[PDB]
């Protein structure tokens, strides 16, 4: 279910899109490759979408919308820090 | 730290603000009252501020809680809009 | 018109449009017909003398108004419950 | 009618009648005319489907409603200030 998706999953997905591989994403995020692989698989399950064959067309759109969500999650953090 | 805050905590916080008490929030969410109390306490620790004071039986939100409620409501719009987009793919 | 003329129904319709991103999605969420959402939002814009929507997207003013309305609705929903119980 | 049709003007008129004990005293306090107070209160009674006054003395329902109403009026005033500033 889409309701099961968490922030960690979204960050891992974004890193794979940005860097072009699971191992490059792991390096960028300071995570273990196993964690990236598992997170992406779980995201595909939750969305019931194939995200990688190289990204699918659906992954390209999801990347754009996720980037916006993450910006707003970080705007929340800025507000929370300022209180 | 702020980085430790999760969605469950924020939904609990919103429910306390909306219902007016820890026990009413727990009832609404199908949780144990002490679980709601402890989650809010952990949120206060993470944000390093007081969200509720207890001067007259039921908790009164602080000024910081009022703002946090508003900003969290805005985040929840964005989270729900993301879910709508994800469902449509 | 006047801010004093704004009613709870208008605020609930506005909240639903803000949350869902469209008049038709708001209608579905609220169990109201699109005509009702459109009319309520138009009336709200008139009463506030603010343009709230401009693929209708919220204005900057609508963004802020969402936050303040959410706050008012904490007390307003409790009050409505009390009124219903009398 | 419907509790959702209640507006801030109605609740301010209600508060003034509760405080002052009469439509004309409320009108004086608010800088409005008695006709406006009478009409607003009637409309509020219709929307709540509650008789609020029976010179007008409050019903049991009015007295009980008012305590919670005072709190909502605080938030309505703050909301209006924000709306005016947009």
UniProtKB/Swiss-Prot annotation, chain B:
Disrupted-gene phenotype: Deletion mutant shows a decrease in chlorhexidine resistance.
Domain HTH lysR-type, chain residue ranges per copy: 3-62
DNA-binding annotation, residue ranges on this chain: 22-41
Subcellular localization: Cytoplasm
Primary role: Regulates the expression of the AceI transporter. Binds DNA and chlorhexidine. Binds to regulatory sites within the intergenic region between the aceI and aceR genes, and affects the interaction between RNA polymerase (RNAP) and promoter DNA both in the presence and in the absence of chlorhexidine. In the absence of chlorhexidine, prevents transcription of the aceI gene by disrupting interactions between the promoter DNA and RNAP. In the presence of chlorhexidine, activates expression of aceI.
Domain observations: Binds DNA via its N-terminal domain and the inducer molecule via the C-terminal domain.
Family per similarity comment: Belongs to the LysR transcriptional regulatory family.
Quaternary state and interactors: Homodimer and homotetramer. Binding of chlorhexidine at the inducer-binding domain causes a quaternary structural change that favors interactions between dimers to form tetramers.
The protein's name in its UniProt record: HTH-type transcriptional regulator AceR
Name of the gene: aceR
Residues represented out of the complete protein: 1 to 87 of 297
């Amino acid at each position: 279910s889409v309701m099961n998706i968490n922030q960690e999953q979204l960050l891992m997905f974004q890193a794979v899109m940005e860097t072009g591989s699971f191992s490059a994403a792991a390096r960028k995020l300071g995570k273990v490759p196993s964690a990236v692989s598992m997170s992406i698989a779980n995201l595909e399950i939750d969305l019931n979408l194939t995200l990688f064959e190289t990204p699918t067309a659906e992954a390209r759109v999801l990347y754009e919308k996720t980037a916006q969500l993450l910006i707003e999650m970080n705007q929340w953090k800025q507000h929370a820090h300022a209180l």
